[PDB]
Amino acid sequence: VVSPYDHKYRIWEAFLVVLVVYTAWVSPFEFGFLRKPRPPLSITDNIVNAFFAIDIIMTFFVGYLDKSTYLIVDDRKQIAFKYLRSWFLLDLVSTIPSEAAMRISSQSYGLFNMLRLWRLRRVGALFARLEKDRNFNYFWVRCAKLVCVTLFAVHCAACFYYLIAARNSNPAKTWIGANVANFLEESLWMRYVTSMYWSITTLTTVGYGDLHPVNTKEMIFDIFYMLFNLGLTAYLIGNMTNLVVHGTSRTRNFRDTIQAASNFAHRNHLPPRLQDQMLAHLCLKYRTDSEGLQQQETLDALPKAIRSSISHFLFYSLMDKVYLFRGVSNALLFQLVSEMKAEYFPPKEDVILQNEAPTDFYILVNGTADLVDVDTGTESIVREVKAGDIIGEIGVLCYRPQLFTVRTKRLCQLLRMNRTTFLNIIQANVGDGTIIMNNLLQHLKEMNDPVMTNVLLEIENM
Amino acid sequence: VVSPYDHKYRIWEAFLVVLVVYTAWVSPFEFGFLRKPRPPLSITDNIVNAFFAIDIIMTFFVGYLDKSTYLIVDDRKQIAFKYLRSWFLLDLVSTIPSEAAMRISSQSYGLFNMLRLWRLRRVGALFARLEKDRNFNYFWVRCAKLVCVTLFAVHCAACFYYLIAARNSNPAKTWIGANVANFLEESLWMRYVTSMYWSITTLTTVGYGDLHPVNTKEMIFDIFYMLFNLGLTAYLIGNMTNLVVHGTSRTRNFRDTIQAASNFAHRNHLPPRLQDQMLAHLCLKYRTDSEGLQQQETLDALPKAIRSSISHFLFYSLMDKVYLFRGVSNALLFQLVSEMKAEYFPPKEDVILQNEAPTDFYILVNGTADLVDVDTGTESIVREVKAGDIIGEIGVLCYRPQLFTVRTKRLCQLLRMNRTTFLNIIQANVGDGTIIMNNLLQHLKEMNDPVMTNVLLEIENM
Amino acid sequence: VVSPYDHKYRIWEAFLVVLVVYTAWVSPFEFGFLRKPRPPLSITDNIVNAFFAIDIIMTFFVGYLDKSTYLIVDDRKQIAFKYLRSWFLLDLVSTIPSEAAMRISSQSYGLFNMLRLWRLRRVGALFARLEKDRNFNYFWVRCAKLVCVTLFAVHCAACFYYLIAARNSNPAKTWIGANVANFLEESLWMRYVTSMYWSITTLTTVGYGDLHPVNTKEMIFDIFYMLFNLGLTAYLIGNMTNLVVHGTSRTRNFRDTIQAASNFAHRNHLPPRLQDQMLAHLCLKYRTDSEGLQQQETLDALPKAIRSSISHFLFYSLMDKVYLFRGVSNALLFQLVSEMKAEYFPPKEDVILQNEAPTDFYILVNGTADLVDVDTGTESIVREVKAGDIIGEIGVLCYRPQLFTVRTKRLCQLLRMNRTTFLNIIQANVGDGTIIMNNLLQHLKEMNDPVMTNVLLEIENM
Amino acid sequence: VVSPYDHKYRIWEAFLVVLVVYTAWVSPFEFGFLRKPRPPLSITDNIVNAFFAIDIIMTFFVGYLDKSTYLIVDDRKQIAFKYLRSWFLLDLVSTIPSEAAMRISSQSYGLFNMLRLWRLRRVGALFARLEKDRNFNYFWVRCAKLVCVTLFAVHCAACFYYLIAARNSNPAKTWIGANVANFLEESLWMRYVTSMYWSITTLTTVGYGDLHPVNTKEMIFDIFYMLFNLGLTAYLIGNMTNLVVHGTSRTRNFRDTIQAASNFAHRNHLPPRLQDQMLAHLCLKYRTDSEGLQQQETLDALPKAIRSSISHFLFYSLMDKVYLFRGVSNALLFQLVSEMKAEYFPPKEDVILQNEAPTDFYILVNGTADLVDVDTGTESIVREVKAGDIIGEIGVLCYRPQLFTVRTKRLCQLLRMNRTTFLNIIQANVGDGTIIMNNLLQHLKEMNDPVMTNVLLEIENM
């Protein structure tokens, strides 16, 4: 019994697609270039016939994945009936050797050799898989699919066109017979290289003009091949345009955003400190790829029982190490952890201005900042904060404008919390506002500062 | 009076467009290769003209979808006024046979045969109709339109360039007279194949170099035809590029989403159960085409009197089979059914965590989940729920944090109901939360558990 | 002062761009094909120089629309300062006749004739203006710009390459002397046609291979011209791709929406009346181009002082001619008019379901609809409403759920008013709720209906 | 220690990329066209190798910007470990002169010279830098990168194909020996020009047909080179298409908006004053490039501690120069300044209608507007307001419909302020509402709208 997702089974898959690439080269070559068996190739041909014999002896069962349950179905019957519904005679007769066919019909040599190209469904499913896969980048996958179909079309056309040249009385006034007088006397590698040269030169529309059609059957095949090439080249340029437009869109929108904001700052004559705070923020929003750019861009599309657990993994020790949440509850901790906004901040940037409306408070993870107070125009720092300290809580828990300006003097990470979101959580778990006010004003009674807020809040209650 | 949207009438339209394809090949061929009528085509010309005369009779009773009413005007007068004011004269004069034209003037055979190309308006209307259809895929419709206009332009150019070769004294020092010494003695099929070969080799810009202009009239025509081909080839690449970019947008955005989120999970070093819950949800959000991905993309655009009846069709027996809604009303059932959000979930995923904020409850359709409680790290299941049961209703009807973690274990389907949305509904039908509390607390006393929720319930009531 | 936006002045501009097209042909032809003045062109050159001297006089009194005021500046000095600082010297030296140039030196004929290509700034400004216009579609504007730059590049390269063939001792063993040895005896039109034929054949990359370079200077020019052609062809395909991708996007997204919703309805097995109600609404949302589709899509971006007066112009007679607003106010009329949502509806579609939540009510503009009441599965129509009547108000002015079901039976236009939006307006102009209730309960006892609310709300009032 | 962001060091970078452009031309030319050392290039080779040896010495002490801190590491050890672990061996071996190679082996001259192309990492990093830079436009950066890779690939193929021509017995029956009889007896410049002509003619797919392959090794190289040119040509067209679609998107969406609004206004038969108010506003919403269009397009994405200071810089003198804010507070001024939405208005446009809902009020920055009042259909101005004065405050501070209609008459700039946003600020700073009412009614009593405003307004108050 063999199930998928098996590392003994994917070896078998990759070995089969290598044999498919073998057949993709060989079957047109036998169709267009060979009448006789020529055992220097035909021995290897019968050998890979034996490989496909042991292949079809092995292939009778493997489990699959059904939809609407997404479970693995392996039950030792229906596992071979389903596989023998569709193509069993095809790859069955695909293994009959050429000696058998010449014993049957000694004119359908290459005609029966051509039949083996059902095997290319493996390559099709492989490319569908790799597009569905997330390990290999989309660029090289689409590029490889294009080069495979291009080389296959070139090879098939060179084989068919040499077939048209050979299967003709009067070898002169054929397309190879027009300039090369005696090509049946020259080698097989030479004739294949000349036919592939013709096919490449025709497909890419270079067309030097040696090796051109002379009679009518060559003209008809060349008309349909050039219509095919026109469609194929349009398909290639379309895929390459898609592939470039996807690949350079993020940098494009980033540059347009930067250009618009810097153009705004110049026509309004902003101070340059404000100007490069703007550009520092808008630059750091970009190159935090999969830290803070993809964070709010992908965590939004999660069903909120997942990103609550993501927030519980990344930030839960930090909410046990802040003074305002000492012994409040355990339900309140998970709920406050579940609704933070982890944000980055480049160095030398104010994150709370003085006399703001009270709306947010922040909790550091890393980096440092300074509390900056102004008196009559001179900026004086007050107190540097450390990674793990809450800032902005004075006035948000109250209803007062903010007291100090907070400038991140290094690269930092803060956790924003909106005020009405903070209150709507602590309107629930009633009686826990008491412990929040208690471990606030027992922290405000500390620090030995000239407490004007402490005397104002006690009258503010009653 | 024949109506449109009719199965007897569409067959007549399709037979007409088959005759239009006939005329599109034959008329440039007559203009380029023929002087006589040559009755082996004149008979078929008069047959096709007879069918077009039958259709120009038949069109006097066929209704039309008029705008501003979107009804069908079918009244045997003003249904001919619209026809005679639009294009009656041109498909009148397209129907006239050519023996009358040679009876008038023995010069205007080809110039009158070229006038039958007014019939291509049917092809244009057909392609517009097929692009407006939802049955035939847009890809091959655009591909068919491009190949038809390409083949028609190649055919017209081949016939015109052969005409420039023909109506010229000294057949030598023409383009076919340059290499083929005696082309007037060789057959008509040979000359048509050679002109198609020239026109293809020029349009695809292969240009082998034989069959080139040698005098000035051929150079002028070839200049204008190469300019037309430049515009046409750019048009084909533009259409194929559009057709590729629209075809591979969904897979592209899905892959970018998966890449960004898996890139997020690696830098933050999440536990792998969390990591493949994330990837399982983001994968299942894709391949629910026309069940869940198209659901909240198309239902939101509907004017809410439609999606309410869609929700009434799919999920109305289910809300009669839950304990919490027994005999409340019939108005409340329709209102709650109207505002459920059906969502899919891959197996092995938490959908409600323990100690969450009480915001949602869910109703199964299919699949099962498990209530999971943690005490000291060890997590045991409590009560597996069945398809058709409600989870999360405790604490939403109350105001308490959630009690158990709900982990799915099959491909489930849940119906989310928001809390404030739920309370805004039961304020209407006021006095019918009495039955809700009644069949809650009577249900809470059915199973054996701590019924301390009834203790906090009654002190909260009175 | 001659103003812009002037019909006496635009005709002068159009005549000037006709003269610029003349110069763009003639100046490279004189540079490459001529040495003498040759009066059949010299007369016309001096005429065109006279017209450009007339315009370089006329440009001293013509107003300009400056920025930061968007007002026409007309001052007769500083209207010449702006002109002299911009391009007065270059179109001065473009205007000088060439007989003075041969008076200076008998070598600088063509090199001075090429300097007249400064006049193409008029063409550039013209194409910028026509892109900023809304009367000429963007498609053919971009197409005309592309064919102009392409024809001009072809023409200049043909002239330069004939010049390289001409200015050469041993005229044989040049590119034109390779096949036509006596090319200096054959006509000027013939040599211009063969040069244009070469130049088209190189630019399209057809490249027949006759008329190819034979010495080193021709090879160097041909390398640079083919690099230019590579860039130019990529530019042309890029413009045509932009022009196709924009032009086929609305139909594309409409088709994708139809495909997704019809796919959704199939796998959920909805009843077909529901299914074609969905398709009728989704179709009618599309083909109301600039009636209802562009209405919500463009009125949203307006600053709400404009669309209020748009709503006031379209629908103000209707709110006077409805019974519920008889003698209410005039401020409340303007405010309710300003916040309606005019919406179209296809025939055979329910717009309000029975037992809905009371959220909206509607007012007909045109079209007809029917009330539908059901009790035991039988749909009985109650009362057809006429174009200009309000439906849905019984329950929104009250708080009860809806009482009937309204199916549109023609192409209708309704005006939606949301309930919470309706109540926020009637708080202002207080006391007008009394007259709304008054002409509501006065309206219940109008037809002497078997009422079941007329006493049920007067007990709520009294 | 040397730092980046330094003008002594960037000049060294530019001089190195000049020497890289030198080596990119010279190394394939030596590989293809030279066997000898030939001191007229060998001297310059040793000079350029000396400069790269100076740079590989100099690079041990130059600071780098590490991630996760965005600071400059400068420590004189581990700043060399990073350099030794990245690419030290490759630009070591690129520096070695070729006389050492001919001391080793007198056949490995060009085979060693081709290894000097490791220096192109300088060019690649330069293009990455210039795309990330915001001073040079993205258009010509991508265009220059494309022409550099195109000319380099052409140059390499020309050198390799001449190498296949040269290293061959029987110089006749090569590709250059086919038409040129004795190419070894002709100049070096001639052979380089002919090889470059072949390589351009093959890459652009013109392909005249002279200079075509005649033996098998040339056919194999030409097959791989035409496949490469197919890939590169699709890549160039894709890049130019990306570049054009991004370059003309703003004008495209603007034109589509203008088209939809003008088409809406025509099918609904609006009065033309309303119609060109619509088009005036929608035009002005475009050509405020980085004044009003990019203003709310970029300030929205800012973390609101930045744009609060932007609003504080641009608009803070104005809030001290308005009568309603005389001595109110100092925190309230910063909060009100922080939440103003500045807009532009084209001339002759109503910005507030009479009998609107009281929702907004506006403060002029620059420009003049008028007040328009209707009596029975005749409208005239009442009072012109000048830049710096507030309009619409009467009735927003109250709860009354508006009193006048405010029409602009120049390019104006107003500051919108929402009513509920205004009240949610003045609920904070309590007691400052008293001074707002006080300096309103002292302004209302002074400004003689004669009696009925001050009297009826005080009836609401007391």
Author numbering:
A (entry chain D), B (entry chain A), C (entry chain B), D (entry chain C): 49 to 510
Paper text:
AKT1 is functionally activated through phosphorylation and negatively regulated by a potassium channel α-subunit AtKC1.
Strikingly, Asp379Ala was identified to be a constitutively-active mutant, which could mediate K+ currents without CIPK23 and CBL1. The result of 3D classification revealed two separate classes assembled in either 4-fold or 2-fold symmetry. The portion of the particles in 4-fold symmetry substantially increased to ~44%, whereas ~24% particles adopt 2-fold symmetry conformation of the CPD. The particles belonging to the two classes were individually subjected to auto-refinement, yielding two maps at 2.9–3.0 Å. In the map with 4-fold symmetric CPD, all four C-linkers exhibit a canonical “kinked” conformation and the width of the CPD is about 80 Å. These observations imply that the 4-fold symmetry structure of Asp379Ala variant may represent a pre-open state. The “straight” helix B’C’ of the C-linkers from Mol I/I’ break into two short helices (B’ and C’ helices).
